[PDB]
Ligand binder design. Structure first.
Ligand SMILES: O=C1NC(=O)C(=O)C(=O)N1
Length: 512
């Protein structure tokens, strides 16, 4: 059992994931009390795409080492992803308690899913950042160059058909064309996926494939290019590499557009946000010194021709009736967010709720939940996984997009609005809970940022039972869509590049 588990750990290392699971299973069966085993069976199954089973292992892992914070955090994040709300209140309290005593175990990105103040979030991101910052030894300090073309770098694991590259690409294209004085460098931590996004990016910047490399080497590689300002678009989220940034390969390091919160990190100099999503009230809760673009913090791909979707029926929708949708990551679909969406459904009879098909049995769960809330399960409709262009097309059948709290739709909110679908949100009290709000505000749709849950249901019921007002809202989105600066990458470029040159001067750049 102790041996098995390690062979199967070997299999794990050499992507023979299928057998890793069958070995680790064989171990777990024979020694069902061994927490370390339960724990490896769990990462095993997960990476063999057996979600439900994977989470079952973390449950037992938790039953065996109840006082263990890291396991508890891992279990909660797994249950959110599967929309399994058994004991969510307790689990959520333990994770927050850990952060408070931290130790250390809560991953900051998972933590974004919790009902937690901007303060707890800072505590959490600082605690993590510290354990990393200590175990590492920074590279020889350097300074922003005095003379010349400013070298600006961005590191990300989604350059290509992913959120990051998918938001930044028209931006990178505008900057090549409008900000010649800036030299744009993309350090891509994932390989060429053959997406036209990946080509475009490579065509608009100098794209370095550092996918082969390790933390130390990556830093050293960035430093080889003598990058003056280095943007972390990663951020505490999956596909590393914070330890890269801890080596401070660049003398100025900016947290932007990727991780919707503070880094808590001593190696991170600036965060870039906006007046709305990061307002003065919230600055004390950022370790970075705050910068702000003139408009919304988020760019997007303003060349996308939204395609034509298949008929409502071929998309599983009925023909008449309002389609309110919430395309978002499953972990964001919390009890509070589902309740308020289902409340709309109850009071507006005709009507339907369109969701992304989640992992494991998430969809069965949300069905059963809808029924518990006294709503026909048939009225939830689930979209499968689809290439961006076909996915993006689906918003054409959407009537109103209903945001989640406390972790807003981010790229999906930008996607809706671009296709012309209004987005309803309740801007909360942390950056991540204010991303929709900031798009709406900057687009001019303040009436779509409402105060609380009751207001959310009220506004949505208003729109859903008055198609006249609803059709007119779309019309309004459309005007605002082409006239606000939110979707003017050209202006966004000019803004960014100027704010970039400014930062550079403060750290002693003499331009030219
Ligand atoms: O481009 C996307 N394709 C998807 O299938 C999806 O779920 C999403 O959020 N974004």
């Amino acid at each position: 059992p102790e041996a098995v588990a390690r062979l199967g750990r070997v299999r794990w290392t050499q992507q023979r994931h299928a057998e890793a699971a069958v070995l680790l299973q064989q171990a777990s069966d024979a020694a069902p009390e061994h927490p370390g085993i339960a724990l490896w069976l769990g990462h095993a199954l997960e990476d063999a795409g057996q979600a439900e089973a994977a989470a079952a292992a973390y449950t037992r892992a938790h039953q065996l080492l109840p006082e263990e914070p890291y396991i508890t955090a891992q279990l909660l994040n797994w249950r959110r992803r599967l929309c399994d709300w058994r004991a969510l209140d307790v689990l959520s309290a333990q994770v927050r308690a850990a952060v408070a005593q931290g130790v250390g175990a809560v991953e900051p990105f998972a933590f974004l899913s919790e009902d937690a103040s901007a303060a707890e979030q800072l505590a959490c991101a600082r605690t993590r950042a510290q354990a990393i910052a200590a175990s590492v030894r920074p590279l020889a300090p350097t300074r922003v160059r005095s003379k010349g073309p400013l070298r600006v770098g961005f590191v990300s694991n989604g350059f290509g058909a992913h959120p990051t590259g998918l938001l930044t690409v028209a931006l990178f294209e505008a900057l090549q064309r409008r900000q010649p004085d800036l030299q744009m460098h993309l350090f891509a931590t994932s390989g060429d996926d053959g997406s036209t996004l990946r080509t475009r990016l490579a065509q608009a910047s100098t794209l370095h494939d550092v996918t082969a490399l390790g933390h130390l080497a990556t830093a050293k590689h960035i430093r080889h290019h003598g990058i003056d300002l280095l943007f972390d678009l990663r951020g505490w989220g999956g596909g590393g590499r914070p330890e890269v940034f801890a080596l401070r390969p660049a003398p100025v390091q900016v947290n932007w557009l990727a991780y919707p919160g503070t880094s808590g990190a001593p190696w991170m100099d600036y965060v870039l946000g906006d007046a709305f999503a990061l307002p003065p009230a919230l600055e004390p809760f950022y370790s970075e010194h705050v910068l702000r673009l003139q408009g919304a913090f988020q760019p997007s791909d303003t060349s996308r021709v939204v395609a034509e979707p298949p008929s409502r029926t071929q998309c599983g929708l009925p023909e008449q009736g309002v389609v309110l949708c919430c395309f978002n990551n499953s972990y964001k679909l919390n009890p509070q967010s589902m309740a308020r969406m289902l409340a709309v459904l109850r009071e507006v009879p005709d009507s339907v709720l369109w969701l992304l098909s989640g992992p494991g049995e998430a969809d069965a769960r949300l069905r059963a939940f809808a029924h518990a809330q006294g709503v026909d399960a048939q009225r939830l409709v689930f979209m499968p996984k689809l290439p961006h262009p076909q996915y993006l097309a689906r918003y054409r059948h959407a009537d109103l997009f209903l945001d989640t709290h406390p972790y807003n739709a981010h790229t999906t909110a930008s996607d809706a609005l671009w296709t012309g679908c209004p987005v309803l949100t309740t801007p909360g009290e942390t950056f991540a809970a204010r991303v929709a709000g900031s798009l709406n505000h900057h687009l001019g749709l303040d009436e779509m940022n409402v105060a609380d849950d009751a207001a959310f249901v009220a506004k949505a019921v208003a729109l859903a039972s008055d198609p006249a007002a609803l059709t007119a809202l779309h019309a309004r989105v459309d005007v605002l869509r082409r006239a606000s600066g939110v979707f003017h990458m050209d202006g966004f470029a000019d803004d960014f590049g100027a704010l970039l040159q400014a930062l550079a001067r403060r750290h002693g750049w003499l331009g030219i």
